[PDB]
Amino acid sequence: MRIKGVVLSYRRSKENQHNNVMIIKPLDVNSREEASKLIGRLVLWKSPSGKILKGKIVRVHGTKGAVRARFEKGLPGQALGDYVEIV
Prior knowledge:
Blueprint: E1 4-11, E2 21-26, H1 32-38, E3 42-45, E4 53-60, E5 67-70, E6 83-85
Antiparallel strand pairs: 1-2, 1-6, 2-5, 3-4, 4-5
GO molecular function, one term: structural constituent of ribosome
Keywords: Ribonucleoprotein, Ribosomal protein
Protein name: Large ribosomal subunit protein eL33
């Protein structure tokens, strides 16, 4: 029912002309069909402080693999490594 994934790298663009970007990589999702079809889904990832963050997938970037994501609420102090989930 639930799903998981693994973060790749979060770009915190200093300036402001494209906003900050975030790359995610769900376990398998080895099908542009499924990946592309998953575009629009909500990523509900857990995290300490009971701070449950929930962003949204924008576009796919890897065809049958990872996808692009963005977070306006940002993540906690250094959180590059926590598994993502679609709860």
